[PDB]
CSV table of C-alpha atoms and ligand atoms in Angstrom, one decimal:
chain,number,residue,atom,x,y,z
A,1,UNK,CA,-30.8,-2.5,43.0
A,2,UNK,CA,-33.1,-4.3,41.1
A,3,UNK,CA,-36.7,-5.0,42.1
A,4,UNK,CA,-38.9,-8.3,42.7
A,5,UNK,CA,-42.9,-8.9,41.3
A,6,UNK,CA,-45.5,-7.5,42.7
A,7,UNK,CA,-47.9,-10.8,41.8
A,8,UNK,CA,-45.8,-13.6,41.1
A,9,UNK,CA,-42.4,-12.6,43.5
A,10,UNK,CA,-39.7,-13.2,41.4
A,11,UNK,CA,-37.0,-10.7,39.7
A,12,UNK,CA,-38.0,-8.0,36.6
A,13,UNK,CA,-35.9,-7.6,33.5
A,14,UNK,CA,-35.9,-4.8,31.5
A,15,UNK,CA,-37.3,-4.1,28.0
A,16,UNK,CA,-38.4,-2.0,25.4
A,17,UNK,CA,-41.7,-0.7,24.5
A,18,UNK,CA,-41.0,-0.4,20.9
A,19,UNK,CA,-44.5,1.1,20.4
A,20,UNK,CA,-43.7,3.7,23.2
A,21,UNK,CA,-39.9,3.7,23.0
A,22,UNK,CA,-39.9,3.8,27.1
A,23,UNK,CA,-37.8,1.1,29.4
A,24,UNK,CA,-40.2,-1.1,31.1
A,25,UNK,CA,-39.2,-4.0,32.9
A,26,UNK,CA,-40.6,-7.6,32.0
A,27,UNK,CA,-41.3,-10.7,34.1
A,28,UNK,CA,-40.2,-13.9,32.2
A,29,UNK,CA,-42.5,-16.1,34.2
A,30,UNK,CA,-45.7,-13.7,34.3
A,31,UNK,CA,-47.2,-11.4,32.4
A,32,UNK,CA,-47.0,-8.5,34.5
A,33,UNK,CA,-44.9,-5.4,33.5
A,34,UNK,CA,-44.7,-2.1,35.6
A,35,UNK,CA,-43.3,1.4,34.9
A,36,UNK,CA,-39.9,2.3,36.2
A,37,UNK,CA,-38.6,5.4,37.4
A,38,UNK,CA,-34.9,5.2,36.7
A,39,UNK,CA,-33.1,4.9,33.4
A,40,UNK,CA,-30.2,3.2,34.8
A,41,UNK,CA,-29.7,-0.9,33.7
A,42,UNK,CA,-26.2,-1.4,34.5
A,43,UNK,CA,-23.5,-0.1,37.1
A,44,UNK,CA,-19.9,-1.2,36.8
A,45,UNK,CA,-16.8,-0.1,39.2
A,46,UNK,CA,-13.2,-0.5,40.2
A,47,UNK,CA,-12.8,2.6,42.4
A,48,UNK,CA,-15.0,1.3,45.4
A,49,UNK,CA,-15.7,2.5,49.1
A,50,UNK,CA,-17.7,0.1,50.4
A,51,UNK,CA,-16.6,-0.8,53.9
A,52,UNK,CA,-15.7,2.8,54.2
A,53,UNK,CA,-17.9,3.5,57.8
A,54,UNK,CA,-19.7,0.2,57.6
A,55,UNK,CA,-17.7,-1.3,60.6
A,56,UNK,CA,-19.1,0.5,63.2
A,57,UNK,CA,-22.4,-1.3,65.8
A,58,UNK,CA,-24.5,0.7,68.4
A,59,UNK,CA,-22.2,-1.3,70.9
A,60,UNK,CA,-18.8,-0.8,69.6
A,61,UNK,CA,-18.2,1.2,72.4
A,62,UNK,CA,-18.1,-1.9,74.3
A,63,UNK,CA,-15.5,-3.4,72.5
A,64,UNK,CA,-12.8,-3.2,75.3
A,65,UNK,CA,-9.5,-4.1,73.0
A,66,UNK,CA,-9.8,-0.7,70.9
A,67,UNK,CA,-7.5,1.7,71.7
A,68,UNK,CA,-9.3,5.1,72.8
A,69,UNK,CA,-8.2,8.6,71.9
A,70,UNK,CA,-8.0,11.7,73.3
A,71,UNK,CA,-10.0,13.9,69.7
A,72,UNK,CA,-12.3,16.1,70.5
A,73,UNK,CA,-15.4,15.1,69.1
A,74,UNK,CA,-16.6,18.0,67.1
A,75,UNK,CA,-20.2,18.0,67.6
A,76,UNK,CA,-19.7,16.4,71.3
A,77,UNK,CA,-17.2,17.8,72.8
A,78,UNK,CA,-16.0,14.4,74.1
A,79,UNK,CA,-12.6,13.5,74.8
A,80,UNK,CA,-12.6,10.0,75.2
A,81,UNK,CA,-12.4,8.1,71.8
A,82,UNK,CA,-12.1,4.5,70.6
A,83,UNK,CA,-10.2,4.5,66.9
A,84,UNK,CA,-9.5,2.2,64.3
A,85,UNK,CA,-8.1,2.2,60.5
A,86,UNK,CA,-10.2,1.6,57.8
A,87,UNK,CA,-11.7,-1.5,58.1
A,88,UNK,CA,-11.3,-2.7,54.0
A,89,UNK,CA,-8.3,-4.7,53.6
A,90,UNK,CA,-6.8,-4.1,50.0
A,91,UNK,CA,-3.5,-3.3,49.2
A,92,UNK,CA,-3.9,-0.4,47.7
A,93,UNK,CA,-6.4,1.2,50.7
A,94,UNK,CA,-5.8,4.4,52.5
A,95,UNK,CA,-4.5,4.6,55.9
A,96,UNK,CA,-6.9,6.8,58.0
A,97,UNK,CA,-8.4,6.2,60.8
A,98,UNK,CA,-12.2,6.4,61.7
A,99,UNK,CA,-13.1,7.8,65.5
A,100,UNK,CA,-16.2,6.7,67.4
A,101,UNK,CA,-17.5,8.9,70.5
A,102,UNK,CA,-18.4,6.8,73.3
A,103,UNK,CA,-20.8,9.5,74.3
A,104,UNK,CA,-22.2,11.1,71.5
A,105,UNK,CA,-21.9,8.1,69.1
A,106,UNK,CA,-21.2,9.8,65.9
A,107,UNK,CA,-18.2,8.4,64.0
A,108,UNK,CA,-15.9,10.8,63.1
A,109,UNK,CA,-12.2,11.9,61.2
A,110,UNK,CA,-9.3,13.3,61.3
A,111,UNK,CA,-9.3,16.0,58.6
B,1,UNK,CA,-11.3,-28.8,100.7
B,2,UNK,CA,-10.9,-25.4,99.4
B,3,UNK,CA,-8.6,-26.1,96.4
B,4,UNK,CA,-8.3,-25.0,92.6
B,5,UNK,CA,-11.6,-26.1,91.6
B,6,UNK,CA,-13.4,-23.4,94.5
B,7,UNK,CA,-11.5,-20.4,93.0
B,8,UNK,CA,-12.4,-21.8,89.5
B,9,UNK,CA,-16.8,-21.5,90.8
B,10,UNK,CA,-16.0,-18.6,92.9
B,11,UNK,CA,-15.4,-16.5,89.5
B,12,UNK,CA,-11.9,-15.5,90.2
B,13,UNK,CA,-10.0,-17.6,87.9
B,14,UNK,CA,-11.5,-18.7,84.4
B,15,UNK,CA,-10.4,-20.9,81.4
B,16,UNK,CA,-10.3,-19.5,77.8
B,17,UNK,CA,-9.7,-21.4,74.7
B,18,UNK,CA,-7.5,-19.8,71.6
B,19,UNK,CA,-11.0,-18.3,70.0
B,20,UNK,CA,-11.9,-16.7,73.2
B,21,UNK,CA,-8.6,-15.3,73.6
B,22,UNK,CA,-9.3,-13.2,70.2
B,23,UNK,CA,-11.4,-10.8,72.6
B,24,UNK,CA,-9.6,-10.3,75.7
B,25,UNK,CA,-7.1,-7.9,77.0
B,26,UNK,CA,-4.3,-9.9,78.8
B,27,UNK,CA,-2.4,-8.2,81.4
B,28,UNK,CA,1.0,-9.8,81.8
B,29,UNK,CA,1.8,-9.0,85.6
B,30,UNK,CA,-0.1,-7.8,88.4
B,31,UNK,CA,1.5,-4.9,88.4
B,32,UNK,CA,0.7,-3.8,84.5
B,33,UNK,CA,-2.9,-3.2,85.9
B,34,UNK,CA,-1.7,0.2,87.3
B,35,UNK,CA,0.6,2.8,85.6
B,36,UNK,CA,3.5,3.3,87.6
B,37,UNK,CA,5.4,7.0,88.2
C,201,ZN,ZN1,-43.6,-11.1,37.6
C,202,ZN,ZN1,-20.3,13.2,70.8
């Protein structure tokens, strides 16, 4: 997650303090520089999760064409459940399901 | 006259185009509505 200027509102890039040997992180259209707290400059994946839980609202309960359940929700109690698969749609994804409480509101999972 | 057009503003019968139909719950019969024996 990278950051945006303080002063002039555009994007830092990182750099190195060759007299200090510590990663700051430069504007190329002011002169401003900050310190960082994190190390990290690059991230790169191909095992992702992202759209895991992410498909859920505050109103998904009122979605009247999921099917409901019958799981007990275990920090509710509730048995009355609307369901539904994980929501990424690769190939490869798992099939699980994910269980929203209609009372309590806490998605939950079979497991 | 009391013809289509009155049920159609008296909220018992509606139209729905094929987007809408993406969120309803159709039942086929009258009789779907309840679970039988
Ligand atoms: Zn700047
Ligand atoms: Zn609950």
């Amino acid at each position: 997650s990278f950051r945006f200027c303080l002063e002039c509102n555009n994007m830092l890039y990182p750099k190195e303090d060759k007299e200090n040997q510590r990663l700051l992180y430069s504007c190329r259209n002011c002169d401003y520089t900050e310190l960082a707290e994190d190390p990290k400059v690059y991230r790169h994946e191909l095992i992702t999760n992202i759209g895991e839980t992410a498909g859920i609202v505050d109103d998904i309960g009122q979605d009247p064409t999921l099917p409901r359940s019958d799981k007990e929700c275990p920090e509710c109690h509730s048995r009355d459940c609307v369901f539904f698969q994980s929501q990424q749609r690769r190939k490869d994804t798992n099939m699980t399901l994910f269980y929203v409480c209609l009372n309590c509101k806490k998605t939950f999972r079979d497991e | 006259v009391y013809g289509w057009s009155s049920l159609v503003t008296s909220g018992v019968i509606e139209y729905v185009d094929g987007e809408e139909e993406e969120t309803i719950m159709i039942a086929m019969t009258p009789e779907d509505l309840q679970t039988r024996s």
